[PDB]
Amino acid sequence: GFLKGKKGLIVGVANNKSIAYGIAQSCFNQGATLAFTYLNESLEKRVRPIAQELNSPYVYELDVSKEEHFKSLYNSVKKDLGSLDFIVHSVAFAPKEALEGSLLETSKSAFNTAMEISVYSLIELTNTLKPLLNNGASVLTLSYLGSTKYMAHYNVMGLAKAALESAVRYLAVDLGKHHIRVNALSAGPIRTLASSGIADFRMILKWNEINAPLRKNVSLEEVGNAGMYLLSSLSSGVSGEVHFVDAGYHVMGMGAVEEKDNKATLLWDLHKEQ
Amino acid sequence: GFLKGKKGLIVGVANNKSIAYGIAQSCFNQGATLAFTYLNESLEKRVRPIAQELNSPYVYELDVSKEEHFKSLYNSVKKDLGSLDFIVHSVAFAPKEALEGSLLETSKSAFNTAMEISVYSLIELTNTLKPLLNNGASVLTLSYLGSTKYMAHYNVMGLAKAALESAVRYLAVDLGKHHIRVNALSAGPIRTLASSGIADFRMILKWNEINAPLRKNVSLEEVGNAGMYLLSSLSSGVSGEVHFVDAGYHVMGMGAVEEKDNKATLLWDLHKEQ
Amino acid sequence: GFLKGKKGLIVGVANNKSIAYGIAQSCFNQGATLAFTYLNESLEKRVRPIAQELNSPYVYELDVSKEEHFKSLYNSVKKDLGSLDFIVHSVAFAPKEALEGSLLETSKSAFNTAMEISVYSLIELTNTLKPLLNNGASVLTLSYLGSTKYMAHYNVMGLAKAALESAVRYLAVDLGKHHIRVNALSAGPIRTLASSGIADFRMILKWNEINAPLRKNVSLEEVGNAGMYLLSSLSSGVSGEVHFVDAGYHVMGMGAVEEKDNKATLLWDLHKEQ
Amino acid sequence: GFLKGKKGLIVGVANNKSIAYGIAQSCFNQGATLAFTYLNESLEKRVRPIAQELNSPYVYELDVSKEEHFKSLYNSVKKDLGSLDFIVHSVAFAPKEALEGSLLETSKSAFNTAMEISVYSLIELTNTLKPLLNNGASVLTLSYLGSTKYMAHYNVMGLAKAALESAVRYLAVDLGKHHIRVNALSAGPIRTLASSGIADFRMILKWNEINAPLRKNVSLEEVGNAGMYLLSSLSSGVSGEVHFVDAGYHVMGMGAVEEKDNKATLLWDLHKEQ
Ligand SMILES: NC(=O)c1ccc[n+]([C@@H]2O[C@H](COP(=O)([O-])OP(=O)(O)OC[C@@H]3O[C@@H](n4cnc5c(N)ncnc54)[C@H](O)[C@@H]3O)[C@@H](O)[C@H]2O)c1
Ligand SMILES: NC(=O)c1ccc[n+]([C@@H]2O[C@H](COP(=O)([O-])OP(=O)(O)OC[C@H]3O[C@@H](n4cnc5c(N)ncnc54)[C@H](O)[C@@H]3O)[C@@H](O)[C@H]2O)c1
Ligand SMILES: NC(=O)c1ccc[n+]([C@@H]2O[C@H](COP(=O)([O-])OP(=O)(O)OC[C@H]3O[C@@H](n4cnc5c(N)ncnc54)[C@H](O)[C@@H]3O)[C@@H](O)[C@H]2O)c1
Ligand SMILES: NC(=O)c1ccc[n+]([C@@H]2O[C@H](COP(=O)([O-])OP(=O)(O)OC[C@H]3O[C@@H](n4cnc5c(N)ncnc54)[C@H](O)[C@@H]3O)[C@@H](O)[C@H]2O)c1
Ligand SMILES: Oc1cc(Cl)ccc1Oc1ccc(Cl)cc1
Ligand SMILES: Oc1cc(Cl)ccc1Oc1ccc(Cl)cc1
Ligand SMILES: Oc1cc(Cl)ccc1Oc1ccc(Cl)cc1
Ligand SMILES: Oc1cc(Cl)ccc1Oc1ccc(Cl)cc1
């Protein structure tokens, strides 16, 4: 496979539906040696089996808000794996209230929480593991259109993702000198533990399905394969990029109508509402 | 005014609803000395009165597909005005068929026409008048979101506008050395002779009205004022820019819902649709 | 003038070279009634005379890190001015260390400071004064190309500005319903108290001067005029926009060479370098 | 392999250094069945042996300026291959003069040639072969940063590439309904027959090498692998995207300096310039 002999750290798995899992799964089918981290002991209940399923005995605790965990992590992968060829950063969080209502109502606390867990953790994760990164290593994080466009009540996470993509660009210049790559995979809406916690997500999901050029929502496998590519040597010439895996949704300047042209009607007015 | 003493050429007026007219109107209110061009004698019937209305006796014939017209134009403005401080390029065309159906169906002839009238003409207009341009001169052209985003059946005009905005960047580097500025005003949908010729434009218009942040379509005056700004010394520090005057529509990543949050419903499903 | 009768709050004046002063100066020349805020008593020494210079007796204390100041600000402008037509948000801070070295070295504390002072403050400032904002009101903030592109050691401030422009988009949708506008002016490098504190800024400045299409650095007046425009009714059709006032620098995909074409040489290898 | 059993048409091979060959090579290593086209009999001298090297006996003549060639192409692939899974569009042309001097000097003829051969050909190629495209088929074309940013004397080809990326977006919507994907690979500068014909290309090449984050130019293999990915089911969730394979160069907002920070000096002033 394209990751045969390669060692990578997967941060962000919560269950078999996690985007991090889709990527880990695809990276595994490519021969990668994987190691996983979990936020707490409850999540570990799902991460461990998943790890074993992917031939991995390396499971470490990691709550990006606890700096001491980063210390242990360094020592852990350095002892178990010795070095890393790729890092998957699939983590983000903001209080439930922040994701509803307007950005205006956001509290200073919710803001900092969103930024620290969703943005700064990439810096700390990368800086902490930099010594263990081999040449050609690849760092991947996840983003969403909400960083550069308005998306229904994405609010503060929108500011976080925009900062995150900027961080991807600066990190690429900081680590590129060492031949290390950094990119962001901008996935289209998909059902996950975090997404199921978002208001009217079924609607955001329905909207993408109908208005996206490929007229369908992206699968966990498609996001996973896209991540695996970004992480492999297949994309050794790619860095600082925000790669879209959203069935082409990002290209839409408005609602689709294309199929019907009698008087041209919104695909939305025809399907998933009437 | 901000254009007092300044001399500009207005290319693109077809009637009192033309964007070029809005711009000319706003520039006039700022003390600008104006000159106008018309495609043919039928359009001249509307351009002349408008020109007189704006205290202008300089009306020249100009069909961008006829190179000889550019020769006469140079001689005309050089004799009547001696020099130009700003140029407004508000012209575009493509066969009716091209704007309906898909891009795939576009013929080679419709493609070339769209590109020559909507893009090359800016090059030839600018190159032809370059010797008559004073320092600080400002060249302005019009574009639409369809250049960088998909908009319903905009098809070939989308490729043209994209090229046009790229031309704006190259022309800014070419003329910037001579202290001349070049920009593109990306207007939101608005009723005009050319727009009225487009299929289901009422819908594209309705859609922008409901989904745009300011919840309304832009007025001709707002587009005009924006243009005047771009043309005046007020923006002497701006060049190679694509300025959006679309009630903020360009920031939308999807349909609006913001106002209603019970279950959060698409503002489209509530207004202009039910 | 275009701001005659209009009332604006200027946040960010440190001295006669602050971008906020340029904007205030330009807005003043347009008949605007102004009110200013200062971070502390040392800054107030410069803010007051400036305020008087601009015919303003409304000077308030405002350190965006102290929530109680926002309460007093509300009560103050509400008592002195009654309502606001525009808000100028020209504030940003980050520890000196963050702006040097790599992003990777940034501490969690510096990160939060950068984000809170430079981004969250726009949210709190706007939310606090929302009730005093009249219809058609305009909120303006300042950004830099470092948000979407890598700029020498801009680091964390780059992430901040990316988030800021994203905030401008979400705030525009939140406030657009109330006919209020929100934009960001992306100014080119310019000598200010804050800029003078940045390493090798003379170089970033020199580089923009030689490589920018208009071959020069932007003047405080140009930035001020651009701001005034964004804040006036002249731009009532503009919102959620990131307006570039950088002598067109943003369009450069590489170093300039355009003038000399023998073998084509980098303008940088010819000027300010030999 | 990821293209095992998949059938694709490679358009644009001139020799063993052509980007189309790098992609064909990578697609071949993935089990794809290939078919090639050549402009004329002189090019065929290089295409055939290459085709045989890639286990391909399907070599067809195709000059995108001759419509009748598209007719023959349809009949040829339909008889030899029956159907297509992916199309590679790696073709562009502009008179030598256009690529030097300014855009302002471009003639109407050079403009049309640049647009027709570099942009319209994708439309015609795709429309002609649409009936032979299986579901999940992928259409790939090549672009360059010069489409959205100014690149030294890229001129009219910059307008063309901008239009080409816009076309990719519209074609993605037109063909997405049929589950077909359309993308654009934006390669970094690389030595090819066409590039060798461009003025001071060694400099543009040198400039990317030193200023790109990965501090190196991209290899033909890297571009090939990126293309193969875009053409394979690995990217089934990607469409209408402009994928950058330029060692991360696109993220640079100015010349690099990062490594040296004493006073921070442009890497350009240190290497390939002294
Ligand atoms: N070389 C680079 O650094 C670079 C960078 C970005 C994009 N590209 C793009 O890659 C594509 C081609 O790649 P390349 O650099 O390998 O060029 P190349 O010289 O290897 O071949 C591309 C050419 O297109 C073909 N062509 C020209 N006119 C044609 C016509 N009328 N009909 C059919 N074919 C025609 C030529 O035969 C030749 O194969 C172009 O779109 C080019 O703009 C190249
Ligand atoms: N689901 C989508 O449609 C979608 C779309 C775009 C982007 N994303 C991004 O993908 C990533 C999440 O993936 P997902 O959607 O599979 O959701 P998920 O729930 O599976 O993943 C979120 C992960 O973040 C972890 N996390 C939360 N707080 C943490 C903390 N303090 N320390 C360490 N880990 C913490 C959770 O434990 C969980 O494993 C996020 O970055 C998200 O923004 C998701
Ligand atoms: N109406 C909108 O919602 C909208 C939105 C975005 C951009 N635009 C742009 O604005 C410009 C047109 O403004 P408008 O909407 O007022 O349309 P309009 O009909 O009022 O103006 C179009 C002008 O172009 C002229 N023209 C066409 N072919 C010509 C030729 N061969 N030679 C000389 N002139 C020629 C017409 O005579 C007409 O005066 C176009 O470039 C268009 O793409 C319009
Ligand atoms: N100078 C440039 O070349 C340049 C370029 C692009 C953008 N900008 C932006 O312009 C804005 C400021 O303009 P400037 O460059 O003239 O800087 P400036 O020094 O004149 O203003 C910065 C202001 O921020 C204020 N500030 C800092 N911390 C504060 C706090 N906690 N509470 C309240 N106020 C606080 C300072 O008091 C000062 O008035 C910044 O947002 C900056 O990022 C500057
Ligand atoms: O970024 C996302 C974008 C989408 Cl469309 C769906 C889910 C996402 O992921 C998260 C992660 C944590 C929190 Cl609190 C909220 C959303
Ligand atoms: O560019 C435009 C965008 C919009 Cl929304 C509405 C009208 C426009 O202008 C034209 C000009 C000529 C032709 Cl043939 C078609 C459209
Ligand atoms: O954003 C900026 C961009 C440039 Cl080019 C120059 C100065 C800027 O403003 C600041 C404000 C506060 C800190 Cl701590 C650092 C920089
Ligand atoms: O697009 C390109 C970009 C670069 Cl950097 C180098 C070569 C390129 O390809 C071409 C193809 C045909 C002509 Cl006439 C000119 C350039």
PDB file of N, CA and C and ligand atoms in Angstrom, chain A residues 11-15 17-21 37-40 43 62-65 89-93 117-118 141-145 154 157 161 164 185-195 201 205 220, ligand 2:
ATOM      1  N   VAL A  11      -5.721  11.161  16.049  1.00  0.00           N
ATOM      2  CA  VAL A  11      -6.324  11.884  17.162  1.00  0.00           C
ATOM      3  C   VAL A  11      -7.710  12.364  16.751  1.00  0.00           C
ATOM      4  N   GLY A  12      -8.750  11.873  17.423  1.00  0.00           N
ATOM      5  CA  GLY A  12     -10.093  12.308  17.087  1.00  0.00           C
ATOM      6  C   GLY A  12     -11.171  11.244  16.994  1.00  0.00           C
ATOM      7  N   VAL A  13     -10.797   9.980  17.165  1.00  0.00           N
ATOM      8  CA  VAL A  13     -11.760   8.893  17.089  1.00  0.00           C
ATOM      9  C   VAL A  13     -12.674   8.826  18.318  1.00  0.00           C
ATOM     10  N   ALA A  14     -13.982   8.802  18.071  1.00  0.00           N
ATOM     11  CA  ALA A  14     -14.979   8.723  19.137  1.00  0.00           C
ATOM     12  C   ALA A  14     -15.793   7.449  18.982  1.00  0.00           C
ATOM     13  N   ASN A  15     -15.910   6.984  17.742  1.00  0.00           N
ATOM     14  CA  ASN A  15     -16.641   5.764  17.412  1.00  0.00           C
ATOM     15  C   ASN A  15     -16.421   5.413  15.946  1.00  0.00           C
ATOM     16  N   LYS A  17     -17.969   5.916  13.470  1.00  0.00           N
ATOM     17  CA  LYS A  17     -18.506   6.861  12.504  1.00  0.00           C
ATOM     18  C   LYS A  17     -17.661   8.121  12.418  1.00  0.00           C
ATOM     19  N   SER A  18     -16.687   8.228  13.314  1.00  0.00           N
ATOM     20  CA  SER A  18     -15.795   9.379  13.343  1.00  0.00           C
ATOM     21  C   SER A  18     -15.004   9.519  12.046  1.00  0.00           C
ATOM     22  N   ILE A  19     -14.869  10.754  11.577  1.00  0.00           N
ATOM     23  CA  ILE A  19     -14.107  11.049  10.371  1.00  0.00           C
ATOM     24  C   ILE A  19     -12.691  10.519  10.566  1.00  0.00           C
ATOM     25  N   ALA A  20     -12.193  10.596  11.798  1.00  0.00           N
ATOM     26  CA  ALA A  20     -10.847  10.105  12.104  1.00  0.00           C
ATOM     27  C   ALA A  20     -10.766   8.604  11.856  1.00  0.00           C
ATOM     28  N   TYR A  21     -11.872   7.913  12.110  1.00  0.00           N
ATOM     29  CA  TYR A  21     -11.926   6.477  11.908  1.00  0.00           C
ATOM     30  C   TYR A  21     -11.936   6.154  10.411  1.00  0.00           C
ATOM     31  N   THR A  37      -5.537   7.969  20.038  1.00  0.00           N
ATOM     32  CA  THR A  37      -5.668   8.659  21.313  1.00  0.00           C
ATOM     33  C   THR A  37      -7.159   8.827  21.609  1.00  0.00           C
ATOM     34  N   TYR A  38      -7.507   8.960  22.883  1.00  0.00           N
ATOM     35  CA  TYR A  38      -8.902   9.136  23.279  1.00  0.00           C
ATOM     36  C   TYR A  38      -9.017  10.230  24.330  1.00  0.00           C
ATOM     37  N   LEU A  39     -10.117  10.973  24.296  1.00  0.00           N
ATOM     38  CA  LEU A  39     -10.342  12.066  25.240  1.00  0.00           C
ATOM     39  C   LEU A  39     -10.428  11.609  26.689  1.00  0.00           C
ATOM     40  N   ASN A  40     -11.237  10.585  26.939  1.00  0.00           N
ATOM     41  CA  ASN A  40     -11.405  10.055  28.288  1.00  0.00           C
ATOM     42  C   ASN A  40     -11.708   8.560  28.290  1.00  0.00           C
ATOM     43  N   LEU A  43     -14.748   7.356  26.046  1.00  0.00           N
ATOM     44  CA  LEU A  43     -14.456   7.277  24.620  1.00  0.00           C
ATOM     45  C   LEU A  43     -13.533   6.097  24.366  1.00  0.00           C
ATOM     46  N   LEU A  62      -5.606  11.422  25.566  1.00  0.00           N
ATOM     47  CA  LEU A  62      -5.255  12.754  25.129  1.00  0.00           C
ATOM     48  C   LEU A  62      -6.434  13.715  25.053  1.00  0.00           C
ATOM     49  N   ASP A  63      -6.489  14.599  26.046  1.00  0.00           N
ATOM     50  CA  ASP A  63      -7.488  15.654  26.129  1.00  0.00           C
ATOM     51  C   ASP A  63      -6.640  16.891  25.832  1.00  0.00           C
ATOM     52  N   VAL A  64      -6.804  17.453  24.634  1.00  0.00           N
ATOM     53  CA  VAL A  64      -6.021  18.608  24.204  1.00  0.00           C
ATOM     54  C   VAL A  64      -6.015  19.832  25.122  1.00  0.00           C
ATOM     55  N   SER A  65      -6.828  19.801  26.176  1.00  0.00           N
ATOM     56  CA  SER A  65      -6.878  20.919  27.117  1.00  0.00           C
ATOM     57  C   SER A  65      -5.927  20.695  28.296  1.00  0.00           C
ATOM     58  N   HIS A  89      -5.325  15.128  12.787  1.00  0.00           N
ATOM     59  CA  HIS A  89      -5.875  15.999  13.818  1.00  0.00           C
ATOM     60  C   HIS A  89      -7.343  16.225  13.524  1.00  0.00           C
ATOM     61  N   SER A  90      -8.197  15.381  14.094  1.00  0.00           N
ATOM     62  CA  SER A  90      -9.635  15.469  13.845  1.00  0.00           C
ATOM     63  C   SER A  90     -10.375  15.765  15.139  1.00  0.00           C
ATOM     64  N   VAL A  91     -10.155  16.960  15.669  1.00  0.00           N
ATOM     65  CA  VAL A  91     -10.753  17.356  16.932  1.00  0.00           C
ATOM     66  C   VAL A  91     -11.295  18.779  16.894  1.00  0.00           C
ATOM     67  N   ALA A  92     -12.434  18.987  17.546  1.00  0.00           N
ATOM     68  CA  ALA A  92     -13.057  20.301  17.606  1.00  0.00           C
ATOM     69  C   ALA A  92     -14.152  20.302  18.664  1.00  0.00           C
ATOM     70  N   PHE A  93     -14.355  21.441  19.306  1.00  0.00           N
ATOM     71  CA  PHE A  93     -15.389  21.548  20.321  1.00  0.00           C
ATOM     72  C   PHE A  93     -15.761  22.993  20.623  1.00  0.00           C
ATOM     73  N   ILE A 117      -9.540  24.284  21.751  1.00  0.00           N
ATOM     74  CA  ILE A 117      -9.739  22.884  21.436  1.00  0.00           C
ATOM     75  C   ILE A 117      -9.681  22.622  19.931  1.00  0.00           C
ATOM     76  N   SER A 118     -10.260  23.524  19.138  1.00  0.00           N
ATOM     77  CA  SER A 118     -10.299  23.335  17.691  1.00  0.00           C
ATOM     78  C   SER A 118      -9.127  23.901  16.883  1.00  0.00           C
ATOM     79  N   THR A 141      -5.559  17.973   9.124  1.00  0.00           N
ATOM     80  CA  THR A 141      -6.592  18.428  10.041  1.00  0.00           C
ATOM     81  C   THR A 141      -7.885  18.533   9.227  1.00  0.00           C
ATOM     82  N   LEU A 142      -9.018  18.652   9.911  1.00  0.00           N
ATOM     83  CA  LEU A 142     -10.317  18.733   9.253  1.00  0.00           C
ATOM     84  C   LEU A 142     -10.956  20.101   9.371  1.00  0.00           C
ATOM     85  N   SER A 143     -11.548  20.566   8.276  1.00  0.00           N
ATOM     86  CA  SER A 143     -12.209  21.860   8.269  1.00  0.00           C
ATOM     87  C   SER A 143     -13.580  21.758   7.606  1.00  0.00           C
ATOM     88  N   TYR A 144     -14.242  22.898   7.456  1.00  0.00           N
ATOM     89  CA  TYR A 144     -15.565  22.946   6.860  1.00  0.00           C
ATOM     90  C   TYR A 144     -15.788  24.292   6.161  1.00  0.00           C
ATOM     91  N   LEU A 145     -16.600  24.282   5.105  1.00  0.00           N
ATOM     92  CA  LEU A 145     -16.900  25.486   4.331  1.00  0.00           C
ATOM     93  C   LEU A 145     -17.226  26.689   5.203  1.00  0.00           C
ATOM     94  N   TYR A 154     -23.283  27.909  12.332  1.00  0.00           N
ATOM     95  CA  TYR A 154     -21.922  27.436  12.549  1.00  0.00           C
ATOM     96  C   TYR A 154     -21.135  28.406  13.425  1.00  0.00           C
ATOM     97  N   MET A 157     -17.553  28.290  15.504  1.00  0.00           N
ATOM     98  CA  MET A 157     -16.781  27.202  14.931  1.00  0.00           C
ATOM     99  C   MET A 157     -16.333  27.674  13.558  1.00  0.00           C
ATOM    100  N   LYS A 161     -12.506  27.450  12.437  1.00  0.00           N
ATOM    101  CA  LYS A 161     -12.062  26.755  11.233  1.00  0.00           C
ATOM    102  C   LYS A 161     -11.275  27.667  10.294  1.00  0.00           C
ATOM    103  N   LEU A 164      -8.030  27.874  11.821  1.00  0.00           N
ATOM    104  CA  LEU A 164      -7.407  26.577  11.604  1.00  0.00           C
ATOM    105  C   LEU A 164      -6.767  26.475  10.222  1.00  0.00           C
ATOM    106  N   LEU A 185      -8.444  18.944   5.316  1.00  0.00           N
ATOM    107  CA  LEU A 185      -9.445  18.273   4.498  1.00  0.00           C
ATOM    108  C   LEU A 185     -10.769  18.943   4.867  1.00  0.00           C
ATOM    109  N   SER A 186     -11.396  19.602   3.900  1.00  0.00           N
ATOM    110  CA  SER A 186     -12.670  20.263   4.151  1.00  0.00           C
ATOM    111  C   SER A 186     -13.770  19.282   3.738  1.00  0.00           C
ATOM    112  N   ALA A 187     -14.324  18.564   4.706  1.00  0.00           N
ATOM    113  CA  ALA A 187     -15.352  17.576   4.416  1.00  0.00           C
ATOM    114  C   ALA A 187     -16.725  18.199   4.335  1.00  0.00           C
ATOM    115  N   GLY A 188     -17.601  17.554   3.576  1.00  0.00           N
ATOM    116  CA  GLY A 188     -18.966  18.027   3.468  1.00  0.00           C
ATOM    117  C   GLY A 188     -19.676  17.492   4.701  1.00  0.00           C
ATOM    118  N   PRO A 189     -20.887  17.979   5.019  1.00  0.00           N
ATOM    119  CA  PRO A 189     -21.617  17.509   6.198  1.00  0.00           C
ATOM    120  C   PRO A 189     -21.740  15.989   6.220  1.00  0.00           C
ATOM    121  N   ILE A 190     -21.533  15.392   7.393  1.00  0.00           N
ATOM    122  CA  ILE A 190     -21.654  13.948   7.530  1.00  0.00           C
ATOM    123  C   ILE A 190     -22.064  13.569   8.958  1.00  0.00           C
ATOM    124  N   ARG A 191     -22.850  12.497   9.072  1.00  0.00           N
ATOM    125  CA  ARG A 191     -23.349  12.029  10.366  1.00  0.00           C
ATOM    126  C   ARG A 191     -22.245  11.446  11.238  1.00  0.00           C
ATOM    127  N   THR A 192     -22.035  12.089  12.379  1.00  0.00           N
ATOM    128  CA  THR A 192     -21.010  11.704  13.341  1.00  0.00           C
ATOM    129  C   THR A 192     -21.554  12.026  14.722  1.00  0.00           C
ATOM    130  N   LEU A 193     -20.815  11.665  15.766  1.00  0.00           N
ATOM    131  CA  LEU A 193     -21.267  11.944  17.125  1.00  0.00           C
ATOM    132  C   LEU A 193     -21.396  13.450  17.323  1.00  0.00           C
ATOM    133  N   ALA A 194     -20.406  14.195  16.844  1.00  0.00           N
ATOM    134  CA  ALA A 194     -20.430  15.646  16.972  1.00  0.00           C
ATOM    135  C   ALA A 194     -21.533  16.279  16.114  1.00  0.00           C
ATOM    136  N   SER A 195     -21.696  15.801  14.882  1.00  0.00           N
ATOM    137  CA  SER A 195     -22.718  16.362  14.006  1.00  0.00           C
ATOM    138  C   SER A 195     -24.135  16.081  14.508  1.00  0.00           C
ATOM    139  N   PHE A 201     -29.222  19.586  11.841  1.00  0.00           N
ATOM    140  CA  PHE A 201     -28.166  19.066  10.982  1.00  0.00           C
ATOM    141  C   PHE A 201     -28.742  18.225   9.842  1.00  0.00           C
ATOM    142  N   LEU A 205     -27.692  18.714   6.035  1.00  0.00           N
ATOM    143  CA  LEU A 205     -27.328  17.499   5.324  1.00  0.00           C
ATOM    144  C   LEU A 205     -28.196  17.322   4.069  1.00  0.00           C
ATOM    145  N   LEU A 220     -18.291   8.187   4.455  1.00  0.00           N
ATOM    146  CA  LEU A 220     -17.179   8.182   5.391  1.00  0.00           C
ATOM    147  C   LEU A 220     -15.934   7.620   4.695  1.00  0.00           C
TER     148      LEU A 220
HETATM  149  N1  LIG E   2     -19.156  15.743  10.805  1.00  0.00           N
HETATM  150  C1  LIG E   2     -19.061  16.632   9.845  1.00  0.00           C
HETATM  151  O1  LIG E   2     -20.074  16.783   8.898  1.00  0.00           O
HETATM  152  C2  LIG E   2     -17.837  17.496   9.759  1.00  0.00           C
HETATM  153  C3  LIG E   2     -17.742  18.409   8.736  1.00  0.00           C
HETATM  154  C4  LIG E   2     -16.620  19.204   8.656  1.00  0.00           C
HETATM  155  C5  LIG E   2     -15.611  19.096   9.573  1.00  0.00           C
HETATM  156  N2  LIG E   2     -15.702  18.196  10.557  1.00  0.00           N
HETATM  157  C6  LIG E   2     -14.578  18.145  11.493  1.00  0.00           C
HETATM  158  O2  LIG E   2     -14.111  16.849  11.762  1.00  0.00           O
HETATM  159  C7  LIG E   2     -13.694  16.784  13.107  1.00  0.00           C
HETATM  160  C8  LIG E   2     -14.619  15.942  13.956  1.00  0.00           C
HETATM  161  O3  LIG E   2     -14.897  14.751  13.328  1.00  0.00           O
HETATM  162  P1  LIG E   2     -16.316  14.079  13.433  1.00  0.00           P
HETATM  163  O4  LIG E   2     -17.251  14.903  12.707  1.00  0.00           O
HETATM  164  O5  LIG E   2     -16.029  12.701  13.074  1.00  0.00           O
HETATM  165  O6  LIG E   2     -16.851  14.159  14.924  1.00  0.00           O
HETATM  166  P2  LIG E   2     -16.407  13.201  16.110  1.00  0.00           P
HETATM  167  O7  LIG E   2     -17.296  13.357  17.240  1.00  0.00           O
HETATM  168  O8  LIG E   2     -16.302  11.758  15.677  1.00  0.00           O
HETATM  169  O9  LIG E   2     -14.954  13.740  16.443  1.00  0.00           O
HETATM  170  C9  LIG E   2     -14.738  14.758  17.364  1.00  0.00           C
HETATM  171  C10 LIG E   2     -13.587  14.324  18.227  1.00  0.00           C
HETATM  172  O10 LIG E   2     -13.048  15.425  18.899  1.00  0.00           O
HETATM  173  C11 LIG E   2     -12.740  14.961  20.176  1.00  0.00           C
HETATM  174  N3  LIG E   2     -12.612  15.961  21.216  1.00  0.00           N
HETATM  175  C12 LIG E   2     -13.534  16.845  21.653  1.00  0.00           C
HETATM  176  N4  LIG E   2     -12.996  17.553  22.640  1.00  0.00           N
HETATM  177  C13 LIG E   2     -11.745  17.119  22.835  1.00  0.00           C
HETATM  178  C14 LIG E   2     -10.750  17.469  23.716  1.00  0.00           C
HETATM  179  N5  LIG E   2     -10.952  18.424  24.591  1.00  0.00           N
HETATM  180  N6  LIG E   2      -9.546  16.833  23.674  1.00  0.00           N
HETATM  181  C15 LIG E   2      -9.336  15.832  22.775  1.00  0.00           C
HETATM  182  N7  LIG E   2     -10.327  15.472  21.908  1.00  0.00           N
HETATM  183  C16 LIG E   2     -11.501  16.112  21.944  1.00  0.00           C
HETATM  184  C17 LIG E   2     -13.857  14.026  20.539  1.00  0.00           C
HETATM  185  O11 LIG E   2     -13.493  13.181  21.582  1.00  0.00           O
HETATM  186  C18 LIG E   2     -14.062  13.300  19.247  1.00  0.00           C
HETATM  187  O12 LIG E   2     -13.238  12.171  19.201  1.00  0.00           O
HETATM  188  C19 LIG E   2     -13.827  18.176  13.680  1.00  0.00           C
HETATM  189  O13 LIG E   2     -12.631  18.868  13.515  1.00  0.00           O
HETATM  190  C20 LIG E   2     -14.937  18.727  12.842  1.00  0.00           C
HETATM  191  O14 LIG E   2     -15.012  20.115  12.894  1.00  0.00           O
HETATM  192  C21 LIG E   2     -16.797  17.403  10.664  1.00  0.00           C
END
